[PDB]
Scaffold this active site. Structure first.
Site, PDB file in Angstrom:
ATOM      1  CG  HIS A   1       0.689  10.574   7.016  1.00 18.56           C
ATOM      2  ND1 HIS A   1      -0.436   9.397   6.202  1.00 18.56           N
ATOM      3  CD2 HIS A   1       0.117  11.863   6.318  1.00 18.56           C
ATOM      4  CE1 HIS A   1      -0.782  10.928   6.007  1.00 18.56           C
ATOM      5  NE2 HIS A   1      -0.372  11.828   6.117  1.00 18.56           N
TER       6      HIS A   1
ATOM      7  CB  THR B   1      -5.897   8.065   5.662  1.00 25.07           C
ATOM      8  OG1 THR B   1      -4.344   7.318   5.438  1.00 25.07           O
ATOM      9  CG2 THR B   1      -5.700   9.900   6.417  1.00 25.07           C
ATOM     10  CB  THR B   2      -5.190   2.265   4.533  1.00 24.23           C
ATOM     11  OG1 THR B   2      -4.787   1.709   5.736  1.00 24.23           O
ATOM     12  CG2 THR B   2      -3.991   3.643   3.930  1.00 24.23           C
TER      13      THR B   2
ATOM     14  CD  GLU C   1      -3.913   9.822   2.640  1.00 22.76           C
ATOM     15  OE1 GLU C   1      -3.230   9.653   3.661  1.00 22.76           O
ATOM     16  OE2 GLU C   1      -4.092   8.739   2.034  1.00 22.76           O
TER      17      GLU C   1
ATOM     18  CG  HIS D   1      -1.332  -1.274   1.364  1.00 18.29           C
ATOM     19  ND1 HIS D   1      -2.487  -1.840   0.791  1.00 18.29           N
ATOM     20  CD2 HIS D   1      -2.044  -1.828   2.362  1.00 18.29           C
ATOM     21  CE1 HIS D   1      -3.652  -2.362   0.384  1.00 18.29           C
ATOM     22  NE2 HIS D   1      -2.665  -3.102   2.004  1.00 18.29           N
TER      23      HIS D   1
ATOM     24  CG  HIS E   1       3.121   5.734   5.204  1.00 18.74           C
ATOM     25  ND1 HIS E   1       2.478   5.204   6.772  1.00 18.74           N
ATOM     26  CD2 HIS E   1       2.024   6.417   5.187  1.00 18.74           C
ATOM     27  CE1 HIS E   1       1.432   6.698   7.053  1.00 18.74           C
ATOM     28  NE2 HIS E   1       1.479   7.048   6.086  1.00 18.74           N
TER      29      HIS E   1
ATOM     30  CG  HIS F   1      -0.496   8.798   2.277  1.00 20.15           C
ATOM     31  ND1 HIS F   1      -0.861   7.991   1.458  1.00 20.15           N
ATOM     32  CD2 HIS F   1      -0.322   8.494   2.457  1.00 20.15           C
ATOM     33  CE1 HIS F   1      -1.313   6.893   2.690  1.00 20.15           C
ATOM     34  NE2 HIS F   1      -0.012   8.496   3.332  1.00 20.15           N
TER      35      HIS F   1
HETATM   36  N1  LIG Z   1      -1.922   6.914   6.784  1.00 22.85           N
HETATM   37  S1  LIG Z   1      -2.014   6.887   8.443  1.00 22.85           S
HETATM   38  O1  LIG Z   1      -3.458   7.882   8.990  1.00 22.85           O
HETATM   39  O2  LIG Z   1      -1.017   7.583   8.637  1.00 22.85           O
HETATM   40  C1  LIG Z   1      -1.901   5.463   8.760  1.00 22.85           C
HETATM   41  C2  LIG Z   1      -0.868   4.809  10.270  1.00 22.85           C
HETATM   42  C3  LIG Z   1      -0.958   3.852   9.831  1.00 22.85           C
HETATM   43  C4  LIG Z   1      -1.343   2.540   9.691  1.00 22.85           C
HETATM   44  N2  LIG Z   1      -1.985   1.062   9.727  1.00 22.85           N
HETATM   45  C5  LIG Z   1      -0.510   0.523  10.855  1.00 22.85           C
HETATM   46  O3  LIG Z   1       0.379   0.991  10.340  1.00 22.85           O
HETATM   47  N3  LIG Z   1      -0.796  -0.756  11.308  1.00 22.85           N
HETATM   48  C6  LIG Z   1      -2.133  -0.914  11.759  1.00 22.85           C
HETATM   49  C7  LIG Z   1      -2.164  -2.282  11.882  1.00 22.85           C
HETATM   50  C8  LIG Z   1      -3.784  -2.956  12.346  1.00 22.85           C
HETATM   51  C9  LIG Z   1      -4.093  -2.067  12.866  1.00 22.85           C
HETATM   52  F1  LIG Z   1      -5.630  -2.821  13.205  1.00 22.85           F
HETATM   53  C10 LIG Z   1      -4.210  -0.906  12.829  1.00 22.85           C
HETATM   54  C11 LIG Z   1      -2.945  -0.077  11.940  1.00 22.85           C
HETATM   55  C12 LIG Z   1      -2.732   3.440   8.847  1.00 22.85           C
HETATM   56  C13 LIG Z   1      -2.775   4.873   8.312  1.00 22.85           C
HETATM   57 ZN   LIG Z   2      -0.357   7.801   5.395  1.00 23.31          ZN
END
Ligand SMILES: NS(=O)(=O)c1ccc(NC(=O)Nc2ccc(F)cc2)cc1
Ligand SMILES: [Zn+2]
EC number: 4.2.1.1
Length: 258
Positions: A117, A196-197, A104, A62, A92, A94
Site C-alpha cells: 500500500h 483497512t485498520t 487484504e 502493526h 507499507h 500486509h
Molecule cells: N492499510 S491502509 O488502508 O493503507 C492504512 C493507511 C494509513 C493508516 N493510518 C495511518 O497511517 N495513520 C493514521 C493515524 C491516525 C488516524 F486517525 C488516521 C490514520 C491506516 C491504514
Molecule cells: Zn495497508
C-alpha cells in the site's frame, strides 16, 4: 485491550471501539473481475515518483512504514479516478504466515501472499491529518505480491528489517526509490473505501493494480521474522496483519481496462 490481529483483538472485535467498521464503504473488498465495469472515462494513472525523498522506516507494531517527505510535491499520484494531486506519505505491506494468504484485497476470492500500500493524501486539505477526515482525502495504490522470482527493488527494504524488528524501532532510510516496487502495467480497478485498520476512516479512493509483482520466498520470509511486540515483551511474530474482505454494499468496482 488495544486492537491488533490476534484472536482476542483482531478484525472481528474492531467494531466495538470503531463502529464505522460496519459502515457503508469499508475496505478491503473482494474484486469480482467479471462484475467490475470497464469505465472508458477513467483517465490514465500518473505516478510521478522521480523526486521522492524517503526518510525513515518504522515498525509501528502493526506493520512497517517507509515514510517520505510530504512537505512539497516530490512524489505524487494524479490522474486515474482522482481529481487533484495526492502526495506520497508512506508505504507499507500486509502479509501472511503462509504464501496462500496475506493480501487484504482478493481477486475472485484469490488471496495473494502480501499486498503493498502506497498511501497518498490530497494536497487541497493541507496535511494528512485533515485529509483522513474527508471522503476524497486519501488515494492508496495497492499492489499484490506473489511468491516467485525476487523483486530487486524490494531488497533494500528487506535488508534493513533486522534493525526494526520490534514495535517502536525506526531506522534512517534515505534515497529509496519506490518506482522499483511497481509492476510493468498500471491497469487498475478503483472503488471508494476506507483505511483497512483502525480508525477505519472512510476517506480512501482505492486504486488496485491488476498486475502483481513477484517477490522471492526469502524476501517474504524476512517479513515474517518481524515482531508485533516491543523489545523485552513476549515475542509474537508479525504475520497475518491483514483484514479480510468486507461487504461491497452499495458500490461498483470500476476497471481501467477491458
Ligand atoms: N492499510 S491502509 O488502508 O493503507 C492504512 C493507511 C494509513 C493508516 N493510518 C495511518 O497511517 N495513520 C493514521 C493515524 C491516525 C488516524 F486517525 C488516521 C490514520 C491506516 C491504514
Ligand atoms: Zn495497508
Amino acid at each position: 485491550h488495544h486492537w491488533g490481529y490476534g484472536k482476542h483483538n483482531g478484525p472481528e472485535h474492531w467494531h466495538k471501539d470503531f463502529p464505522i467498521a460496519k459502515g457503508e464503504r469499508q475496505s478491503p473488498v473482494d474484486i469480482d473481475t467479471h462484475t467490475a465495469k470497464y469505465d472508458p472515462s477513467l483517465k490514465p494513472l500518473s505516478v510521478s515518483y522521480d523526486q521522492a525523498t524517503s526518510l525513515r522506516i518504522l515498525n509501528n507494531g502493526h506493520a512497517f512504514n517507509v515514510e517520505f517527505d510530504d512537505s512539497q510535491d516530490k512524489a505524487v499520484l494524479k490522474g486515474g479516478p482522482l481529481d487533484g494531486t495526492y502526495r506520497l506519505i508512506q508505504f507499507h505491506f500486509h502479509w501472511g504466515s503462509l504464501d496462500g494468504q496475506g493480501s487484504e484485497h482478493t481477486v475472485d476470492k484469490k488471496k495473494y501472499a502480501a499486498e503493498l500500500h502506497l498511501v497518498h493524501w490530497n494536497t487541497k486539505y493541507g496535511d494528512f491529518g485533515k485529509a483522513v477526515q474527508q471522503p476524497d482525502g486519501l488515494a492508496v495504490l495497492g499492489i499484490f505480491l506473489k511468491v516467485g522470482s525476487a523483486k530487486p527493488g524490494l531488497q533494500k527494504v528487506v535488508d534493513v528489517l533486522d534493525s526494526i524488528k520490534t514495535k517502536g524501532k525506526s531506522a534512517d532510510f534515505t534515497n529509496f526509490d519506490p518506482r522499483g516496487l511497481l509492476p510493468e502495467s498500471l491497469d487498475y480497478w478503483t472503488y471508494p473505501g476506507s483505511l483497512t485498520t483502525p480508525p477505519l476512516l472512510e476517506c480512501v479512493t482505492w486504486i488496485v493494480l491488476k498486475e502483481p509483482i513477484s517477490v522471492s520466498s526469502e524476501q517474504v520470509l524476512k517479513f515474517r521474522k518481524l515482531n508485533f511486540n516491543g523489545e523485552g515483551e513476549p515475542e509474537e511474530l508479525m504475520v497475518d496483519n491483514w483484514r479480510p474482505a468486507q461487504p461491497l454494499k452499495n458500490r461498483q468496482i470500476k476497471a481501467s481496462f477491458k
